[PDB]
A paper describes a structure:
Bromodomains (BRDs) are protein interaction modules that specifically recognize ε-N-lysine acetylation motifs, a key event in the reading process of epigenetic marks. The 61 BRDs in the human genome cluster into eight families based on structure/sequence similarity. Despite large sequence variations, all BRD modules share a conserved fold that comprises a left-handed bundle of four α helices (αZ, αA, αB, αC), linked by loop regions of variable length (ZA and BC loops), which line the Kac binding site and determine binding specificity. The four helices form a deep cavity that is extended by the two loop regions (ZA and BC loops), creating a largely hydrophobic Kac binding pocket.
In order to determine whether the diverse sequence and spacing of histone Kac residues can be accommodated by a single BRD, we systematically determined cocrystal structures of [name](1) with the diacetylated peptides H4K5acK8ac, H4K12acK16ac, and [name]. In all cases the two acetylated lysines bound simultaneously and with identical conformations to the [name](1) Kac binding site. The N-terminal Kac always formed the anchoring hydrogen bond with the conserved asparagine (N140). In the N-terminal region of H4, flexible glycine residues allow variable peptide conformations with two (H41–11K5acK8ac) or three (H411–21K12acK16ac) linking residues, whereas the large side chains in H415–25K16acK20ac fit perfectly into surface grooves created by the ZA and BC loops. These structures explain the similar affinities observed for the various combinations of di- and triacetylated H4 peptides. Binding of di-Kac marks separated by three residue spacers as found in sequences linking the H4 K8/K16 and K16/K20 required a glycine or a hydrophobic residue in the first linker position for optimal binding to the first BET BRDs.
Numbering used by the authors:
A (entry chain A): 59 to 167
B (entry chain B): 15 to 24
The structure:
Protein backbone atom coordinates (compact mmCIF):
# COMPACT_ATOMS: atom_id res chain seq x y z
CA UNK A 1 0.00 0.00 0.00
CA UNK A 2 2.98 2.31 -0.81
CA UNK A 3 0.81 4.69 -2.87
CA UNK A 4 -1.67 4.76 0.04
CA UNK A 5 1.21 5.32 2.53
CA UNK A 6 2.37 8.17 0.25
CA UNK A 7 -1.15 9.49 0.40
CA UNK A 8 -1.17 9.19 4.20
CA UNK A 9 2.10 11.20 4.43
CA UNK A 10 1.74 13.81 1.69
CA UNK A 11 -2.02 14.35 1.76
CA UNK A 12 -3.49 13.09 5.05
CA UNK A 13 -0.69 13.95 7.53
CA UNK A 14 0.28 17.09 5.62
CA UNK A 15 -3.27 18.60 5.81
CA UNK A 16 -3.89 17.76 9.50
CA UNK A 17 -0.40 18.92 10.55
CA UNK A 18 -0.85 22.40 9.07
CA UNK A 19 -4.29 22.76 10.77
CA UNK A 20 -4.80 25.45 13.48
CA UNK A 21 -5.86 22.68 15.85
CA UNK A 22 -2.91 20.28 15.15
CA UNK A 23 -0.50 21.53 17.80
CA UNK A 24 -1.69 19.54 20.90
CA UNK A 25 -1.37 16.42 18.66
CA UNK A 26 2.05 17.06 17.12
CA UNK A 27 3.99 15.47 19.98
CA UNK A 28 3.31 12.91 22.71
CA UNK A 29 0.96 14.05 25.46
CA UNK A 30 3.09 15.76 28.02
CA UNK A 31 1.45 14.47 31.24
CA UNK A 32 4.04 16.19 33.46
CA UNK A 33 3.67 19.65 31.89
CA UNK A 34 -0.13 19.23 31.75
CA UNK A 35 -0.62 17.79 35.26
CA UNK A 36 -2.29 14.55 34.11
CA UNK A 37 -1.08 12.06 36.74
CA UNK A 38 -3.46 9.30 35.49
CA UNK A 39 -2.86 9.71 31.70
CA UNK A 40 -0.18 7.06 31.46
CA UNK A 41 -2.41 4.59 33.36
CA UNK A 42 -5.74 5.16 31.59
CA UNK A 43 -4.09 5.38 28.11
CA UNK A 44 -2.47 2.03 27.24
CA UNK A 45 -1.22 3.02 23.74
CA UNK A 46 -0.11 6.63 23.51
CA UNK A 47 -0.14 7.98 19.99
CA UNK A 48 0.39 11.36 18.36
CA UNK A 49 0.91 12.79 14.81
CA UNK A 50 4.60 13.42 15.56
CA UNK A 51 5.09 9.69 16.08
CA UNK A 52 3.00 8.91 12.99
CA UNK A 53 5.08 11.36 10.90
CA UNK A 54 8.25 9.61 12.00
CA UNK A 55 6.76 6.22 11.13
CA UNK A 56 5.79 7.45 7.62
CA UNK A 57 9.21 8.97 7.15
CA UNK A 58 11.28 6.05 8.55
CA UNK A 59 9.56 3.17 6.71
CA UNK A 60 7.92 1.80 9.85
CA UNK A 61 4.65 0.74 8.16
CA UNK A 62 4.03 -2.48 6.26
CA UNK A 63 0.66 -1.24 5.00
CA UNK A 64 -1.58 1.84 5.08
CA UNK A 65 -4.06 0.10 7.49
CA UNK A 66 -1.45 0.20 10.32
CA UNK A 67 -1.11 3.93 9.83
CA UNK A 68 -4.83 4.52 9.77
CA UNK A 69 -4.97 2.38 12.94
CA UNK A 70 -2.44 4.78 14.61
CA UNK A 71 -4.47 7.87 13.64
CA UNK A 72 -7.59 6.17 15.16
CA UNK A 73 -5.71 5.31 18.34
CA UNK A 74 -4.69 8.98 18.74
CA UNK A 75 -8.33 10.22 18.38
CA UNK A 76 -9.65 7.39 20.66
CA UNK A 77 -7.18 8.24 23.39
CA UNK A 78 -8.46 11.80 23.26
CA UNK A 79 -12.14 10.79 23.37
CA UNK A 80 -11.74 8.18 26.18
CA UNK A 81 -9.60 10.40 28.42
CA UNK A 82 -11.07 13.90 27.97
CA UNK A 83 -14.27 15.71 29.01
CA UNK A 84 -17.01 16.33 26.44
CA UNK A 85 -17.06 20.01 25.40
CA UNK A 86 -13.47 20.73 26.40
CA UNK A 87 -11.25 22.52 23.85
CA UNK A 88 -9.03 19.41 23.30
CA UNK A 89 -12.05 17.32 22.30
CA UNK A 90 -13.43 20.01 20.03
CA UNK A 91 -9.99 20.17 18.43
CA UNK A 92 -9.79 16.33 18.04
CA UNK A 93 -13.23 16.28 16.46
CA UNK A 94 -12.41 18.89 13.77
CA UNK A 95 -9.16 17.01 12.92
CA UNK A 96 -10.95 13.66 12.86
CA UNK A 97 -13.51 15.03 10.42
CA UNK A 98 -10.75 16.27 8.04
CA UNK A 99 -8.97 12.97 8.50
CA UNK A 100 -12.11 10.95 7.64
CA UNK A 101 -12.73 13.18 4.52
CA UNK A 102 -9.17 12.58 3.31
CA UNK A 103 -9.46 8.82 4.18
CA UNK A 104 -12.68 8.44 2.15
CA UNK A 105 -10.63 9.72 -0.86
CA UNK A 106 -7.90 7.07 -0.21
CA UNK A 107 -6.40 5.97 -3.51
CA UNK A 108 -7.08 2.38 -4.54
CA UNK A 109 -4.29 -0.34 -4.21
CA UNK B 1 -9.39 15.21 32.30
CA UNK B 2 -6.99 17.59 30.11
CA UNK B 3 -9.30 20.66 30.80
CA UNK B 4 -6.95 23.46 29.57
CA UNK B 5 -8.26 26.20 27.29
CA UNK B 6 -6.49 25.87 23.87
CA UNK B 7 -8.79 27.47 21.22
CA UNK B 8 -8.24 31.27 20.91
CA UNK B 9 -11.26 33.55 21.66
CA UNK B 10 -11.80 37.30 20.79
Amino acid sequence: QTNQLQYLLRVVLKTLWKHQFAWPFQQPVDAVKLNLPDYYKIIKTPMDMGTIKKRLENNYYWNAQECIQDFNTMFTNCYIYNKPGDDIVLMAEALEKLFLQKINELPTE
Amino acid sequence: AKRHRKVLRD
